[PDB]
Amino acid sequence: AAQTNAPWGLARISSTSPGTSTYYYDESAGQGSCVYVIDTGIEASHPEFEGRAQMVKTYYYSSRDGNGHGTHCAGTVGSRTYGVAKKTQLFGVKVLDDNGSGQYSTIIAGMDFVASDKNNRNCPKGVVASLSLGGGYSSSVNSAAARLQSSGVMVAVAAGNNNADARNYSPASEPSVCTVGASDRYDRRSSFSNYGSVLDIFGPGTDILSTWIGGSTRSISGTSMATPHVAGLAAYLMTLGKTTAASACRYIADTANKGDLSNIPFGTVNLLAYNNYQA
Numbered sequence: 001a002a003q004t005n006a007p008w009g010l011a012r013i014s015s016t017s018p019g020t021s022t023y024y025y026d027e028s029a030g031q032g033s034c035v036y037v038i039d040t041g042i043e044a045s046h047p048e049f050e051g052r053a054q055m056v057k058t059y060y061y062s063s064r065d066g067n068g069h070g071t072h073c074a075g076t077v078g079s080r081t082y083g084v085a086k087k088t089q090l091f092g093v094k095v096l097d098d099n100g101s102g103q104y105s106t107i108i109a110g111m112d113f114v115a116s117d118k119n120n121r122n123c124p125k126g127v128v129a130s131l132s133l134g135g136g137y138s139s140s141v142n143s144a145a146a147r148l149q150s151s152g153v154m155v156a157v158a159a160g161n162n163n164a165d166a167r168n169y170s171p172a173s174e175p176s177v178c179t180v181g182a183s184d185r186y187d188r189r190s191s192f193s194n195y196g197s198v199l200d201i202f203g204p205g206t207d208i209l210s211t212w213i214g215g216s217t218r219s220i221s222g223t224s225m226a227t228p229h230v231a232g233l234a235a236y237l238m239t240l241g242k243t244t245a246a247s248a249c250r251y252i253a254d255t256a257n258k259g260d261l262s263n264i265p266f267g268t269v270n271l272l273a274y275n276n277y278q279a
Helices: 008-013 069-078 104-120 139-150 223-239 248-254
Strands: 033-039 053-058 089-094 126-131 153-158 178-183 201-204 208-212 216-220
Touching: 008 201, 008 223, 033 069, 033 104, 033 223, 053 104, 069 089, 069 208, 069 216, 069 223, 089 104, 104 126, 104 139, 104 153, 126 223, 139 153, 153 223, 153 248, 178 223, 178 248, 201 223, 201 248, 223 248
Parallel strands: 033 089, 033 126, 053 089, 126 153, 153 178, 178 201
Antiparallel strands: 208 216
8 A cells, every 4th residue: 555645754664765755555554453552642533543543541530632742642653644553443541641741650550551451452463552751760660661561562662852871761771662762854863862772773753743632733753753653563563464562673673774874873773663565
């Protein structure tokens, strides 16, 4: 399948070169997979989600996304126009308030929630969790992310936006999950992207168009935007049967575009997520 005039990041993940604008992908499109977006919520009524998104859990007075961040990330996972895996099922877990903040205890509870809640959902092709959040190092936060991964969920987490080594941030620094840095449309490391040996992969993160609250769209930047590209890619590849939740991060690294990014610090992987789809 070909989506013309796609957002640059979608075109990038199906291309061996920057500078194109068509997204190519297998029509299975993540059908039968599920992606949890652990964030500020998801505006499931957005026409871009086509009835495939739903809120399943909140820790606050509403499950609605009063911020936009979670809706944007969910759109990059799975919206019809802005999403990588256009037929996946999206499940929202609201661990962040409408200012975008959340206590680590709530975030940990949300991760353990997903590890159990997947047993209440139909995801025959597999389960992914996208975590566009983080703060300073916490062994308890890292352990929660490790449990979620161990339970059979492909966990993708943002590296962070400090232009610093991600070893000092959580859940970015958890070795067993997939830690995602951000790149721009010219294949440069995004100016804000964290780096370091704990990163597994880069995805598009600068000037990413996606869904927003109020039935709208906007372009924003962050490792929060790169993470759902990788989460959606994992769901897509699992639906194709090419990998599993336990092996998808390694598979994405195995099959990435290699050595094509600029300003990658010595010791950080130079790997850009790529779907290897041959039309």
